[PDB]
Design a protein around this ligand. Structure first.
Ligand code: BB4
Ligand code: ZN
Length: 168
């Protein structure tokens, strides 16, 4: 199925919505997962949360590999443990062309359901751990800019809106 999902941009208030847990991993949820990967890859991202495409369910897709063949699905993820501190200049498909250093845990341990509905546990570090935290934030209506000063958040909003006016 060819995805028709649309990635929301700030300051759309639906990006602040808190997603509900998935009740059952069935064929419909699998189609959402597969469409989210297609949209992620088309937009040249490494992660996507359902909130970013106006689906208010706890679903994340991630692929941090160069060859785009390492598909991680997190349904109803739970953070079990974290340690250390790090940060990179993160970007976000919903905050186009803006980047900023964000504090993150260096290592995380999560549990989630996979695309088949099977529970699994994953220990991650590095970029993958940062991306898991970023995407889980989306599901509770949080964006990377929320960690910056209020002035910097205002400048980010203004730049995205200008970019979005220019389009069309
Ligand atoms: O839209 C996205 C994915 C994404 C795009 N560029 C990024 C840079 C760093 C991190 Br972490 C995540 C991303 N997240 O919701
Ligand atoms: Zn994002």
């Amino acid at each position: 199925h060819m995805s028709v999902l649309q990635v929301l941009h700030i300051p759309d208030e639906r990006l602040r919505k808190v997603a509900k847990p998935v009740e059952e991993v069935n064929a419909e949820i699998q189609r959402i997962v597969d469409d989210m990967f297609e949209t992620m890859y088309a937009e040249e991202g490494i992660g996507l949360a359902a909130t970013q495409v106006d689906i208010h369910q706890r679903i994340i897709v991630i692929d941090v590999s160069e060859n785009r063949d390492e598909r991680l699905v997190l349904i109803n993820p739970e953070l079990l443990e974290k340690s250390g501190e790090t940060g990179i200049e993160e970007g976000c498909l919903s905050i186009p062309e803006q980047r900023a250093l964000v504090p993150r845990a260096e290592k995380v341990k999560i549990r989630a359901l996979d695309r088949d509905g099977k529970p699994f546990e994953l220990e991650a570090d590095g970029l993958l751990a940062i991306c898991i935290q970023h995407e889980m934030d989306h599901l509770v209506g949080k964006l990377f800019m929320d960690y910056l000063s209020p002035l910097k958040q205002q400048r980010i909003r203004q730049k995205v809106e200008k970019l979005d006016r220019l389009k069309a």
